[PDB]
Scaffold this motif. Structure first.
Motif, PDB file in Angstrom:
ATOM      1  N   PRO A 116      45.592  20.912  -1.391  1.00 37.82           N
ATOM      2  CA  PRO A 116      45.575  21.942  -0.851  1.00 37.82           C
ATOM      3  C   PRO A 116      46.180  21.818   0.985  1.00 37.82           C
ATOM      4  O   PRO A 116      45.840  21.052   1.411  1.00 37.82           O
ATOM      5  CB  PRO A 116      44.752  22.795  -1.132  1.00 37.82           C
ATOM      6  CG  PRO A 116      44.325  21.255  -1.150  1.00 37.82           C
ATOM      7  CD  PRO A 116      45.091  20.648  -1.462  1.00 37.82           C
TER       8      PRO A 116
ATOM      9  N   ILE B 227      45.412  31.070  -4.557  1.00 35.22           N
ATOM     10  CA  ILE B 227      46.271  29.916  -3.773  1.00 35.22           C
ATOM     11  C   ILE B 227      47.033  29.087  -4.077  1.00 35.22           C
ATOM     12  O   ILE B 227      47.532  28.316  -2.998  1.00 35.22           O
ATOM     13  CB  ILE B 227      44.726  28.407  -4.533  1.00 35.22           C
ATOM     14  CG1 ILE B 227      43.328  29.499  -4.027  1.00 35.22           C
ATOM     15  CG2 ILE B 227      45.079  27.408  -3.408  1.00 35.22           C
ATOM     16  CD1 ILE B 227      42.493  28.628  -4.561  1.00 35.22           C
TER      17      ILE B 227
ATOM     18  N   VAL C 206      44.834  26.858   3.724  1.00 35.44           N
ATOM     19  CA  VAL C 206      44.831  27.082   2.170  1.00 35.44           C
ATOM     20  C   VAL C 206      43.450  27.171   1.956  1.00 35.44           C
ATOM     21  O   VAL C 206      42.444  27.487   1.860  1.00 35.44           O
ATOM     22  CB  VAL C 206      46.103  26.740   1.711  1.00 35.44           C
ATOM     23  CG1 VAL C 206      45.367  26.946  -0.222  1.00 35.44           C
ATOM     24  CG2 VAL C 206      47.352  27.401   1.358  1.00 35.44           C
ATOM     25  N   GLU C 207      43.002  25.593   2.328  1.00 34.98           N
ATOM     26  CA  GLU C 207      41.249  25.508   1.651  1.00 34.98           C
ATOM     27  C   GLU C 207      40.754  25.665   2.437  1.00 34.98           C
ATOM     28  O   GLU C 207      38.983  26.021   1.969  1.00 34.98           O
ATOM     29  CB  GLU C 207      41.522  24.161   1.745  1.00 34.98           C
TER      30      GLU C 207
ATOM     31  N   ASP D  68      49.721  28.031  -0.516  1.00 36.41           N
ATOM     32  CA  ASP D  68      50.124  27.106  -0.770  1.00 36.41           C
ATOM     33  C   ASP D  68      51.751  27.245  -0.382  1.00 36.41           C
ATOM     34  O   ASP D  68      52.615  26.888   0.559  1.00 36.41           O
ATOM     35  CB  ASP D  68      49.594  25.937  -1.433  1.00 36.41           C
ATOM     36  CG  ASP D  68      49.349  24.651  -1.364  1.00 36.41           C
ATOM     37  OD1 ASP D  68      49.047  24.529  -0.085  1.00 36.41           O
ATOM     38  OD2 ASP D  68      50.494  24.170  -1.155  1.00 36.41           O
TER      39      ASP D  68
END
Lengths: 87, 85, 87, 81, 84, 84, 85, 87, 81, 87, 87, 85, 87, 85, 87, 84, 81, 81, 87, 87, 87, 81, 85, 84
Positions: free
Chosen positions: V8, T37, V12-13, T41
């Motif tokens: 985030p 993640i 991404v989330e 990002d």
């Protein structure tokens, strides 16, 4: 071992069978008959070559032989060897 | 083993595939070295190919026949080519 | 490695040099420069081949390259390899 | 390896009389060998070949006799450094 | 190895003169070579001749000049190479 | 192994006769086989039957003839094979 | 070693292939990482490629030149790309 | 190592020689000159690519470089690497 | 170690042109080296330095060229005994 | 060991020699006589110091000694040590 | 080794140099010339003793010798040895 | 080694630093034992000190000269003192 | 490690504190604070020196620093080091 | 590590104790080598001492500032002095 | 190490701090800061001593220092050491 | 260890503000710290807070700023530290 | 080591109610511990002590109860990084 | 391996009643096994198969009973040489 | 190895023999000739396949080959492999 | 493995998703989901790329995939890899 | 492992997705997603095959699946496997 | 690994405020961590990720402060089973 | 493990993807053996494929459903095919 | 590991209710999972929620129900898994 013998003598080629003056012979040495057949199949699929035979030289080793014009034999032997890895 | 047998008796030579002045034998590893040795041999001297003997363990023994000087020269040629592959 | 490549594409032989079509290229990998030069000398002495160049690929390894007809290149590489062994 | 090759074919020497070779370890041993060779005998430096692993092979040409002498000189100098 | 060869024969300076002496600093990696080179031309009245790549990551820097300069220059060169 | 089989059944001599005995010299490599063969037909009134390639570089030479001949022939054959 | 040499003397820079504000050097393993590092470097900052130095053992050292800030940024970019291949 | 670098900068490509804006470069890293040449030959045989050179980076390693459009370079580098295995 | 130092400061050589040094193992190798040096080139023996552990360092002085030649000669003789 | 003793008693410096007062003595311990002489040479070249002598203390170890003002001796010993390393 | 020899015979002392009938000799055996000089310096600083010399007995060992009245020599040899530890 | 050489030829004795009836040699470890041995020797018998020979490895060989009986007695005295330090 | 630095630059001394042009600095490197304090105490007891500080450089190492005229600093650093052994 | 950082940003240099043309760093073992390196540095070139950083494990890193050429020369001087103690 | 130095020179105690003469200083070397503070607490609780400071000398070692009359310092350091053990 | 702490309490930023985030790059040696610091203030709108010497040659550089800046800054910082 | 000391003498705390200590490994674990402590309970950060070997000891003060709670929180956060 | 296969499909035996196999080590053991088989029972030799590693597999055919007997005989003879 | 090659080129199947096109070839590698024959027998018993031949590739290895429609060959090779295991 | 594939066939990119042609795909193989993640990002933050998805291939390995123009994908994968290292 | 399954049952193929009666399925088992994608790309480049999916079977293993006529699938699976070696 | 990622990007989330991750060993530790997280703080469970080798990574979202607290809680619960 | 579970409760069978007389499970190594086992199974008996379960470590478990005799026969067929690849 | 979680929060039962408790049986291989599942729904008034494949051949079966049922069900489930 993968090998292309260029310009072999007729006697040299005839004793392997296929009496001809082939522009080249290609040889793919394989382990076991599965690799041998997959190699041969890949070989005739990839280029204008003729199967000469499978030579069983002992210890599970089968060396596949093709004959044809140079470029085809070069291409075929590479295809045959790659196919042998894949089994 | 690279070897020249000097006056092969007829039975001995026939069974390998006429009566010749000498026989030459080059034992190679694999079929590639065998064909290369065969090729260098019939090219280097006035000798005739008799055959390949597959004696197991990947070993192929190439046999030529001809007059003595030629067979000596041929066998040396054959052995050299077999090394280089 | 002692090796003969039959029918090299011109692009392949041109890079090694120089601007040529050749029925074959022969390569003799030697240890050190004296073995290379002795090899080079035996090759052009034994057959109708032309010296193409020596490739210094590191670790003291020098690879001598010749071009010519199939037969000459076959003969020359064997001669060259022998010479390299003897020094 | 120290070596004298007697009749290099012209093609071979391009890529007469004789060629001498002194294989040295490092460039410092190479130059000392070179200086010793051209000082000790009537020979000409041909060049230095960098063949990897720090090995530099020094080459001289000349008459056989001069080249024989030069190469022994070159090898001695390379040892002593 | 750091080395000063005292009266290099003209042919020997094939590499790049009648110069009174040659200095050599054998270095590890190109960074040590460049730092050695830079420290050398800075510490003395010497002229860079070139760097020789002899393999195994080893690069030998070559300088030329008067004896005193070349002695001092190579010493500086070797020290620069140490500190990187 | 050198071996003489005394009254080989006719079927057993499939390999190549009613011949009074068979002799066998197991040799290492084709050179030892040919030398064994040559020494065999030279030392006695026997006839070569053939060479059998049984793998692992082993070649067995087969001769046929009268008992006395075959006994002597195989002994010669084995000795020839040793000396190569 | 990733390195920036700040005021290269002219002789030093010329022999590597003008007088520049700084030199950047990224030592890579193999030619692939070298070209990637070179590529990331000229892309990430206002620097100019000087050349690749093949120093043996598969090592290729990429050298760029330019102003100080740019060369710092370029060398970091180069080192990162060299890792990732 | 087999690698295709896409869209390299001209300076990046020029220093290797062949000053061009090639759509891609392909690299096959080989051991020894035999694998190098067989790879190169296989490469120009398999696709519309141009040989750029053999880079001798030491320790017997020769990295063969081609340039051309993307698809050809992808295909060529695979052919080159397979050919290198086969020697 | 065989070494030629090019411009020894006078203070240094007291404690011109050039100095040569041949480090030998034992006195017998030292003298053979010395004899070979003064025979082989136009140099003068300066002295032998006993630096311990059986090592004797032979010193010659002369022109650079002569000293270079002398020291190679000296080292060869010491090997051969 | 590389070392500077500041303000040596005259008795101490006199034994080493010769009959002198010095703001400092510098000592460079070298391996072999070539390293000592190179060190000696770099020391009197780098600073206003005077060579005092070389001490052969065994095991191939030679210690070079200089005298002078504090600053010169500090500088000279570093120069000398560096020279000794480089042979 | 630290040692004070009391009442040595003149011949015994003279051969070391400093022909005298010294009330005592003090000896500090040191390793290397740095420890030797620091010891000597500490020795003449600590008591009314005269430096006789540094004896280089091989293997890097330097034995420093002083002469003087008993009490001074006792004190000096202790100072000399302590100084040798500290380098 | 503790040793007495009985009729030293003149060249032999001179080079060590006159023609004496005998020479005594005591090989000691370090200078302290050497001086102690020297001291015990000239004290124990009618012998004269010739010198100390520093032959390396910390070894110092003390040499005395005198008539035979005295030199025998001196060398024993010297060796004993050298042990005890 | 025991060390006397002679004639240090003011900036060099000031950053340690005690801004002065001291004729010398003496340093005794000790293990733990007990050896450090006993050393310092021995140091100011033995000679006309001023304590500059204890430098804690990690791993239990404390390096005690004094300043003063040369002779005093030489004597003090020897006393400080001996005291450190004795704890 | 002996190191020269070429255009220290102000925050970076201030926190170490003005904006300087370059920073020099010599990492030494123990305080003695540190002071010697500091001393050799301010003596060998036109550089100013910034401070000693005690980073643990007996390591002291000496930092100087000044123009580029001077700082290069100073750091080499510093490293040499640190070795020799 | 647990330690009492009797009659510290003022220079010695002043550096540790602060500006004082004391019949004695006591030092307790502890592992970690909790052991130091527990030690500090037991020391000023057990006797008429004053906390001087804690010295972080690295490796997690913290040395607590007190001052006072001989008797109190003797008692306090034993108390402090005990406390340090028990955490 | 490279670390971003997202809403540091005001007291926690004793070290040196209400700043939206703190970033930390733990480095080996002072050179890696300074290079990390320099790369950090260059790559983003962040402000150096200081370097913490925690022993064993380890120096942790601290930056403060908006989240996005501090994320990017620390990543740059860690990379700079690698390359020295 | 996590520790709560109940009545630190004023001299001791200078160099009331209670003191809490969380020993963390590295500065990152230190701050996470600190943030967790001051968030989780009514305590005040006193400071961080760098005692070497990368160990940072975080200190809080407050009522006994708050300090007990804070220190457990601080230790948990340091583990989780 | 000694084996009797009871109803070989004709294709299988080409490439009825029963087949017997005696695997022997070397040709000498093979022939002794063969001679013993055809002497001991009313069976016919089919052939010898050289399957490598010096192994020769002797084959007989006949009624089940004869083949069972023959194969035991063949194996015994091969052991005894 | 137990293996099925789908759609073998006729050249490939012809060499093995005999003069045929087959939707598939199946190969069972067996240890020794009894396992091969048992395998051969189970294969032609289990499905509509035709025995093609047995390949003696050395080391006591015998590979049995069948041809037929895909389904039969899939089934037959599994049957054959099982039989080979059981002897 | 960090990787850029230039000019992916649409079939190749569609399976990964979603229904797109892209000048390039970039892949960052990360250890654990936090590294993935963070990588994800940094990639979309550093360049004009679009997140394609994360592939959980087992053993805690998560591979993050992006698409975009050649330049952005080259830049983004380097950014992503860096982020993954730092957690 | 490289495999061509000929004539699979629809249910067998459908559960992998792509409900069809494909003449064959080809499978190339790869390590990591880079080898997987390069394989897939090589596969659709080399022959008329359709990508069916990447099956993540754990431990970093990704098995790429294609469907199509027999000859194409044979050729594609060989290309896919060769491409996987080359990363 | 316990981790809190602060901003985030939406992409991404998808594949605001903050995200929390607790990596647990086994599903039982996963759920206990999940239950502890949603009980201990004002956060929402996002999901559990099975990344292989029995590892399950639990994800929560919420304000930074809540997520910080939740994740410490989640990690503690997973240890204790 | 090759296994037949005889009267799967509905919840048990549904979650795997109706109420069947028996379930068959063949655990294979890799996807190739899985598809081969699946293929041999639906071919050898009157059973229906339920799905492949990828349970990690390269293991794929093939599940079929059908009447008891058929499922027994199918599972044996499946296991055999899985071995032979 | 066999586990009963006593008052699972509603969100936690994302997997598949307000149910009084959840039971979990971690099994080796899919056969042990299915046997565990079957034994679970047989031994008690519980409802299968699903099987979670967490890798390494490990499959965790999940049941829901009243506490007493789930306690008994998981115990049965674990035992079934042992016996296969």
């Amino acid at each position: 071992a993968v090998h292309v013998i260029p310009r072999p003598h007729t006697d040299v080629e005839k004793i392997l069978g296929g009496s001809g003056g082939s522009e080249a012979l290609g040889m793919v040495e394989t382990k076991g008959l599965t690799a041998a057949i997959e190699a041969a199949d890949a070989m005739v699929a990839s280029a204008n070559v003729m199967l000469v035979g499978y030579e069983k030289i002992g210890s599970g080793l089968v060396t596949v032989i093709v004959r044809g014009d140079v470029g085809a034999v070069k291409a075929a032997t590479d295809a045959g060897a790659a196919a042998a890895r894949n089994v």
